Amino acid sequence: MIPGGLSEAKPATPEIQEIVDKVKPQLEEKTNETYGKLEAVQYKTQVVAGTNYYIKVRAGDNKYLHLKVFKSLPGQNEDLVLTGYQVDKNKDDELTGF
């Protein structure tokens, strides 16, 4: 039958790291919250009224983060949008139910 949770988990390339830079800059200017120039190390994708993304970004060559990059649809707001993110989380942290 169908699974019960998020998808798998792959490494983050420059494109995926751009996906974050797509709404993560706004993310930063959204909660007036700054991180410190992070890079993507891994990520995934969700599934809703479009397609949400989840990118795991590092934070100091050792710390990490996790932010969103939702992609609505062309017929309405094709542009991207942040559904929720994360800061100095960890490796054994959770990603769903968030």
| DSSP-H helix ranges across 1-98 | 14-30
In angstroms, the CA 81 to CA 73 distance is: 11
Q: Return the C-alpha torsion angle 54, 58, 59, 65, nearest 10.
A: 30
Q: Tokens 């983060």 sit at which residue? A: 65
Which token pair is 36? 């410190």
In angstroms, the CA 20 to CA 26 distance is: 9
| CATH code, domain with 19 | 3.10.450.10
Q: Is 96 exposed, middle or buried (0-12, 13-18, 19+ CB in 10 A)?
A: exposed
- Write out the residue range of the structural domain in which residue 75 sits: 1-98
**Residue 69 one-letter amino acid:** V
CB neighbourhood size of 55 (10 A): 28
Q: φ, ψ for residue 15 (rounded to 5)?
A: -65, -50
CB neighbourhood size of 83 (10 A): 16
DSSP 8-state secondary structure symbol assigned to residue 31: T
Q: How many domains does the chain have?
A: 1
User: Beta strand pairing status for 10-11 and 53-57?
Assistant: unpaired
